Amino acid sequence: MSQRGLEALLRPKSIAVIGASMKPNRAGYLMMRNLLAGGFNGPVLPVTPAWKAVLGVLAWPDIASLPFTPDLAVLCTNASRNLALLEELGEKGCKTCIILSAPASQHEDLRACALRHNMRLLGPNSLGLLAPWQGLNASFSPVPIKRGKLAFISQSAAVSNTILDWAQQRKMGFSYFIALGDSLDIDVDELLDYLARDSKTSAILLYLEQLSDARRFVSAARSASRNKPILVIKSGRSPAAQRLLNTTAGMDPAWDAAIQRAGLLRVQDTHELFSAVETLSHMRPLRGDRLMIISNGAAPAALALDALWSRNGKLATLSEETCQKLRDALPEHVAISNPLDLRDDASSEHYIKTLDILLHSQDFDALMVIHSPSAAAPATESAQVLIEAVKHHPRSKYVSLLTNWCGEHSSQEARRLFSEAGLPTYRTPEGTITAFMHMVEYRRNQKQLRETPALPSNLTSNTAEAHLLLQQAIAEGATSLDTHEVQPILQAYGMNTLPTWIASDSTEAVHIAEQIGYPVALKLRSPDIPHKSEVQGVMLYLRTANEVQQAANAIFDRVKMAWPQARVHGLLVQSMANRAGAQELRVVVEHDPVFGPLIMLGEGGVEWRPEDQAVVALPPLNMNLARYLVIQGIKSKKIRARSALRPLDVAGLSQLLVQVSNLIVDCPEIQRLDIHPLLASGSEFTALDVTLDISPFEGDNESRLAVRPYPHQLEEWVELKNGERCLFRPILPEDEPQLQQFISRVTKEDLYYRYFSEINEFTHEDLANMTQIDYDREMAFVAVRRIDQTEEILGVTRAISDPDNIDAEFAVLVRSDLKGLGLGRRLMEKLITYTRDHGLQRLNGITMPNNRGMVALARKLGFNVDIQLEEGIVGLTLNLA
Amino acid sequence: MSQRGLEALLRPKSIAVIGASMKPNRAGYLMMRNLLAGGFNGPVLPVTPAWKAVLGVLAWPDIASLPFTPDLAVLCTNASRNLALLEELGEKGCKTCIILSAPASQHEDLRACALRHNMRLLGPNSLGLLAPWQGLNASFSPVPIKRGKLAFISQSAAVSNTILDWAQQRKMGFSYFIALGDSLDIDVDELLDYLARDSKTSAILLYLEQLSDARRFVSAARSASRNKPILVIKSGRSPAAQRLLNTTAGMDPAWDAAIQRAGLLRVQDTHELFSAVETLSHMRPLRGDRLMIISNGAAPAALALDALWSRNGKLATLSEETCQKLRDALPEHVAISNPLDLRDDASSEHYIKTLDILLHSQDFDALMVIHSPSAAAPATESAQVLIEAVKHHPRSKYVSLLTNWCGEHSSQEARRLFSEAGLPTYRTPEGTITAFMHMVEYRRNQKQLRETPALPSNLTSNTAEAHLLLQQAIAEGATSLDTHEVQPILQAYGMNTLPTWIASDSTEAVHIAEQIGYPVALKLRSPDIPHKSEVQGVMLYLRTANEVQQAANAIFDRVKMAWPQARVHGLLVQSMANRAGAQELRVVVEHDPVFGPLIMLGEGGVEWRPEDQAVVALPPLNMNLARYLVIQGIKSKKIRARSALRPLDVAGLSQLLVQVSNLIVDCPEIQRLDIHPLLASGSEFTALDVTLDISPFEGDNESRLAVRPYPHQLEEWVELKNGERCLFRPILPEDEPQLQQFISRVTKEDLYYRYFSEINEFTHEDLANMTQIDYDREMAFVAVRRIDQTEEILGVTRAISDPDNIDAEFAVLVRSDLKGLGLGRRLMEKLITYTRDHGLQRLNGITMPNNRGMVALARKLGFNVDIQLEEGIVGLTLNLA
Ligand SMILES: CC(=O)SCCNC(=O)CCNC(=O)[C@H](O)C(C)(C)COP(=O)(O)OP(=O)(O)OC[C@H]1O[C@@H](n2cnc3c(N)ncnc32)[C@H](O)[C@@H]1OP(=O)(O)O
Ligand SMILES: CC(=O)SCCNC(=O)CCNC(=O)[C@H](O)C(C)(C)COP(=O)(O)OP(=O)(O)OC[C@H]1O[C@@H](n2cnc3c(N)ncnc32)[C@H](O)[C@@H]1OP(=O)(O)O
Ligand SMILES: CC(=O)SCCNC(=O)CCNC(=O)[C@H](O)C(C)(C)COP(=O)(O)OP(=O)(O)OC[C@H]1O[C@@H](n2cnc3c(N)ncnc32)[C@H](O)[C@@H]1OP(=O)(O)O
Ligand SMILES: CC(=O)SCCNC(=O)CCNC(=O)[C@H](O)C(C)(C)COP(=O)(O)OP(=O)(O)OC[C@H]1O[C@@H](n2cnc3c(N)ncnc32)[C@H](O)[C@@H]1OP(=O)(O)O
């Protein structure tokens, strides 16, 4: 757990090799050779009973004979010695170990032994790790490595070797390269936490097959991706691959939803992985999504345009002033527009003139340069002149460059030169377009996740009634419920349903059917098989009573012949007037073994297969996320906009989805929910048929989800000295405008005291950072009071903890005109109580002398005060909270 | 046009270079250098007034000074000299010319000049052509070339150079390489006709941007692909690309349909083009679709499996006996199944043993071998041992091998070694799967096009009634017709429609609505209104008499208040059709400027965008092709078989599509047809709303289509000497079983006379060859008589022409027991009349001197008879066909 302890693995001062050997075909031999060639600054200690020296290095007979305690150890021996060697290492005092091989029946003993001695293990069957900046190569890989700024994490040795070979071809390096093996003790989330703070790393790439702890992964990825881009490839999308990899449990749309919610992006295949390596290594970050293209030929540009159109990209438009490329610069047979075709006989000088003129403008955000083989412009010379021209231009640092030099045999030297100058290069124009659109989409998703949500209109949630009804249902032994029984539960949360009636025989069915509209639907009450399709028990559109009697008798007869023993409660009759022009939708909620409950949206009438015709999301939902889900559904053509005559209403559907999310979050007894179909008619949404599967539950009900929901139990009413009453509660994303006003009503000196600097404005991004928090790692309380249905913020306090949950940093601020009423003390006391109950061990803060009020309050609250004059700093620390 | 005239271009004996020069930067200099370096067996003659010699070759001052007439000439000069130089060449007697440069305003004069002198032209704006086996490089390209068996045709210079460079990297060659430029005179269909007969060519690859004569292209590709595979890539799918290339007139789904109908396969992007080059060059033809996979790692195999699943491929299943693998030295920890994962520590010997055992079995049709970098199995050694093992195995020629060696830096030499031995190799597993599935799909499409159609249900086609009604409609200035007016026209061809009876004004609207007291289809329309969105009229929950009254009266008020100027019209009644319960479909027919009329099938989701939600086909259709269209629609998830509760009836939909095709083929006055709500309710299909746009026609009906339809006008009744009456008509694909019986009733000696050999079998493929013909290039007549609703064939004749339409080979055969009644003479006379009318010049045939009857009949018919004894052959020729 503790981030302390990974230091020995990633920055060791000494390493021991157990099983080093002189035989050239042995694993110990290869590991020793790699370590000696790495460039390490510490000692490498071989341990073996069969040799007095290995590759010129004096050896030691056994572990106990070592002159001192090694930082890191590697086992290169048969699995049958694992436990004894591990025990000896634990006795010696080593704290980190890499294990070459082990069967699956050994995991429990290994974990117990590691716990006994407080040792960390890198997954068994691991290839190893490489850290070029420390000159460390502790791996069994036959491929060399070079220094760089990209980090890679893999759960597969073959992929690791392949990527290393690709990097060798292109003269590119890394900052860290780690193989996880079986991930018994050390796992992906800890490494993400570590890499988020490494100064030499600027981007992260991952290949994954399975996970064990979803919430920690989501939180770590969300925290890490705030300042560095992260991409992921995940295999095993088909039944045969799942069987091959032994990962049959789980569902792939859940992976899609989880990856999207954390701010990452998924790549599809091997080619895109290589392109991602190139792009993350060399491309400059984007400032927009306008593209400009120039070429010495038409057809390659046409192919690029087709690729761009397939992905909904945007072409840049030239201005009238920039169009002076016609006047003198270029010959008269070149048409001036985007894309710019310089023709087959273009020379390098044309390229340079065009590049200069284009760079001195502001009409685009990225530039694509295409070159095909030609006599008038040899590849190497044109590449050299391009590199020089880009180097010497004053405004080159404002746009992103991309190069695509076609011709495999004649472009080798040009590509080599591009690599050493730090400019990205690609093999085909379609690949270039794909690489560009990847980053465009990444930025779009990150921006979309952070817009300000609106307040919800409806606020109805009668939790107690729903629990009461569900408890009564489970008491009798019921395991599923139908529309008639489910209507009150849905109504308790503000959802409408079509009325239905119960009939015990065909006579009553006919009586009620004629009492209502004759076009009706009949449904048997089947408690044995709840499946509609099994017996095909739903039939509809019966215009005449005679049809009703015939259908009822047919159902009864086929039941008594096919399956008489089943218990019969009667039929269900409902009027269905002719309506299909109203749009029909389907909503399903299911439980994933890995990520927990999942919400899916799709079309109603058609057959159900979520892998291809459904969009997904993780609860809990607010208005913004539900809107995002609906708009994704519309864009991907899986949901037809205005399928009915009336256009679809987005806001009402978002509200309904929010209500469904509330219901699912509140009641853990529900295992599955299905609305088939949901009728959309303007601003009216109604449920036609609905089913629920229920079961007893025993747990906390908060650890169920991958994202911690809003902690409603922390709300509390307080009374001040003057008698005023207010509410203390956690902060919400919807609070942004009121926070803007609150900041507006604070003086400059108080802002200087709070933020230790001068602040003239807070943008939307800072406010979003303040209001949209992860409740597992951060907490903030606000004090509010209501005036004529409008809230108002009086103060705020905050605490930010470390990933290990040991230390946290605190702050507090009160409105300038409400100083001496006791708000600060109450806020701080509530924060102290919460942090102590959460499991933290310390609070830390920093302020300056001449902030007398804060120092006095901290002394009143029991803090330890450290005034360091001559540096103008005061330290504050509180122990048991 | 004339296949004779291409010999000078493709196999010249001498060449003249107009405008050769000694300046290294001139085009003539480059052409001269290429030609002298190519290895030509003839003379190269430079013509220029500015040099006495060029690159050591004596020069001549002008064209008139040449010592003899050259076969081929090349123009390397400014476009302003084109016409004068061409006139001089025509005077000298040259018959072929390549033109470097010309603007679009010159085309008419160039065509006229070429026609005057009987000269063929390549280009203009053409890169040239290369023919390695003749040692000829007459082109302006800077990339070298090598001998091979693949041929390539391109409409783009940059793509040509890129492909040549790619081939240079991989050490592969070509048989012919030709660039078309503007295709003013020489075009694609003539080149396909020529390449179909070239002995050194075994496959063909094309890059295209536009066409000018669809009929000839389709026919030529159909003929050529019978014995050689052909792939195509076509760019310009988006409006921006179309604007860039000046090809906005066409429609891409028409290209899709045309490519499919001719038996070819379309490739998507640049990567697939490179893979296609590799596959056509090296892979052995498939005999099945079962795949086997082995690897030295799991994850690459899993990626392969995912790619295979996404394309609906088939995995092979091992037999129990092949469990020799468990014994044959594979370690105990390897699991025996497909894919077979030899572990990371696999050695070369394991590979060789597995390969031997697998090759000695019959469980699969293709084998994929994956290798990742490792210490135990170095790349080069493993490749060498694999090559030797494959070379020495007796059964290697029964399966197709594919290799995928990952790791760019370390596998260069291995890929080179694979190239020299003729084994295909690919960069990534996904690419390998894609390459395999391309050929699988190609074979599947070719097989599907040739199954036996079933006879139709003797549908009605009253052409006279439909023509009379359409002429009456146009006589009154009508430009479009609605459902009421088009009901009889649809009924004439056997298609059901909603009822069409008259009704009076709005006061009678409610009365006719209540005439049955339920919703029913009443139409109120404006004919001048461009759009139908104003109507907003659909009968859904306009049920109750109160509903009828109120809604209908309000609708009348709203509809009639809108527009005073519009010419309003009266009412007339139709009945309600249920569409909510039933499944809704859409059918549209449109006219394409290139390929002619097109038929589109869709789901009918209100929103209509054929580019992504429709399947397409070319008329005329029979039952087989219509079924193929429907099944394609179902497989792509564009139309649901289960949108309604009732399963979809394929046969009835096929029959309906055939009826629509008949209607469209018969009546050229129709420009567009739209059946928006086509209802399917099992075996019942009815049209709800339908529109027709009509216009006068003045051309030739048969020439509108890309495929010549069945020539019904050639049927004729004849009576024989004995008085029996029978029908002579062209052959049909539906005649296969009757032809089988007819062949069954012929004696062995007559079969020897007919086929000049002993034949003990006619498979389904030979019969398909006999019965499925292209009517523009082949004609066959059968004589049939009716017996109790069952037909029987008495004889058959055939004539197969050449693409130039000058010569044709003929044959005849009569049932053994019906000889001596006049059938042979009548069949031959009908054939002679038809061939003379078609425009052929000559008829040829061969037989043997013991066939007295044929010789006597040919003498009776006026043939010239030449008997060559000592060789056992008799030649027959008739001079005017
Ligand atoms: C994740 C990856 O891709 S790693 C690269 C791919 N390679 C692999 O997956 C294969 C890994 N496995 C192997 O190499 C082998 O199967 C092994 C090493 C696991 C087992 O080999 P074995 O012969 O069973 O090993 P064993 O433990 O008996 O002996 C290994 C060495 O340890 C030495 N040794 C024995 N006892 C001890 C001891 N107590 N302390 C130290 N060394 C010892 C033995 O002398 C032997 O050395 P030597 O051959 O020079 O005399
Ligand atoms: C953590 C960091 O990085 S430092 C940032 C701290 N925040 C700021 O400086 C923001 C600006 N200041 C403020 O917001 C407020 O002044 C705060 C938060 C410092 C204090 O909140 P307030 O509402 O003013 O305090 P409150 O009324 O609860 O006072 C509590 C105790 O402080 C004492 N106190 C407050 N100000 C002073 C003062 N200037 N001198 C002496 N005692 C003081 C009061 O006597 C009271 O004592 P008591 O409980 O024994 O009767
Ligand atoms: C895709 C490809 O084809 S590769 C890329 C090239 N693409 C292109 O479109 C072609 C590029 N364009 C060019 O090279 C130039 O524009 C050209 C060749 C078309 C015209 O150049 P111009 O200088 O106008 O040609 P012009 O006809 O005047 O002279 C060319 C040569 O013909 C010679 N010439 C002049 N009159 C005659 C004549 N009656 N007969 C023969 N030769 C003649 C001239 O001497 C000159 O030779 P020189 O340079 O050794 O003195
Ligand atoms: C076509 C090629 O390239 S060669 C392959 C030719 N095909 C065959 O040999 C297939 C086997 N034979 C047959 O199918 C038939 O016998 C055919 C096609 C040769 C003749 O067709 P038939 O129906 O027998 O001929 P039909 O009755 O029309 O006779 C036409 C004339 O031929 C004459 N004739 C036919 N057979 C003979 C014969 N063996 N000897 C002399 N005269 C003959 C008849 O007298 C008649 O003459 P007439 O018009 O002056 O009265």
Side-chain angles (χ1 to χ4, degrees), chain A residues 30 140 142-143 156-159 161-162 165-166 168-169 207 209 233-242 244-245 268-271 274 296-303 305-306 309 315 339 341 344 372-375 406-412 427-431 517-519 536 540-541 543 576-582 584 603 605-607 611-613 637 640-645, chain B residues 30 140 142-143 156-159 161-162 165-166 168-169 207 209 233-242 244-245 268-271 274 296-303 305-306 309 315 339 341 344 372-375 406-412 427-431 518 536 538-541 543 576-581 584 603 605-607 609 611-613 637-638 640 642-645:
Chain A
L30 171 56
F140 305 94
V143 191
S156 164
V159 172
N161 289 317
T162 302
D165 211 87
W166 188 96
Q168 187 180 14
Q169 175 64 28
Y207 166 86
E209 277 169 356
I233 180 163
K234 193 252 169 202
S235 70
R237 307 163 92 115
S238 88
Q242 287 170 357
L244 167 64
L245 295 171
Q268 302 305 309
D269 60 28
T270 306
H271 271 140
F274 295 158
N296 67 342
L303 294 161
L305 288 175
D306 285 345
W309 183 65
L315 282 173
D341 186 12
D344 304 310
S372 281
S374 78
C406 314
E408 292 310 292
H409 181 262
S410 70
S411 289
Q412 313 276 82
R427 279 175 85 243
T428 78
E430 290 104 337
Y518 289 95
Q536 222 281 299
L540 49 151
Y541 278 103
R543 289 181 185 172
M576 86 151 308
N578 191 39
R579 81 260 309 290
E584 313 170 73
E603 293 266 351
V606 301
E607 169 62 53
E611 276 64 28
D612 47 36
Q613 63 222 114
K637 300 298 175 297
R640 302 317 208 299
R642 189 168 68 82
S643 182
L645 66 96
Chain B
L30 174 57
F140 305 98
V143 190
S156 163
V159 172
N161 287 324
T162 292
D165 208 81
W166 188 96
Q168 188 184 12
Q169 223 278 322
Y207 167 87
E209 280 172 355
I233 178 154
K234 191 258 175 204
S235 68
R237 310 168 91 125
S238 79
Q242 285 169 8
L244 170 62
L245 295 168
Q268 299 309 304
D269 61 27
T270 304
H271 270 139
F274 292 161
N296 70 331
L303 294 159
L305 284 179
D306 282 352
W309 183 66
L315 281 171
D341 180 10
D344 297 303
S372 266
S374 84
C406 310
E408 294 306 299
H409 184 262
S410 78
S411 77
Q412 321 261 72
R427 279 173 89 244
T428 76
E430 292 103 334
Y518 262 87
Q536 183 41 230
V538 72
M539 296 69 201
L540 173 134
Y541 204 85
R543 194 194 309 170
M576 180 171 174
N578 188 19
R579 71 208 65 179
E584 318 110 292
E603 52 289 323
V606 185
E607 183 264 334
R609 195 87 41 70
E611 275 64 21
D612 49 32
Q613 61 208 158
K637 305 300 179 299
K638 296 185 179 189
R640 320 305 217 290
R642 214 63 161 83
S643 176
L645 76 97

Side-chain angles (χ1 to χ4, degrees), chain A residues 721 750 753-754 756 810-815 818-826 845-848 851-854 856-857 860 876:
Chain A
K721 320 179 304 192
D750 279 4
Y753 283 151
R754 167 62 177 84
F756 226 131
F810 80 94
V812 57
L813 173 62
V814 172
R815 217 164 78 183
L818 309 166
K819 225 70 154 293
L821 313 179
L823 270 171
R825 188 208 257 276
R826 293 305 288 268
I846 271 293
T847 196
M848 77 266 297
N851 196 0
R852 315 267 146 160
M854 182 78 258
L857 172 58
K860 290 264 181 52
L876 318 163

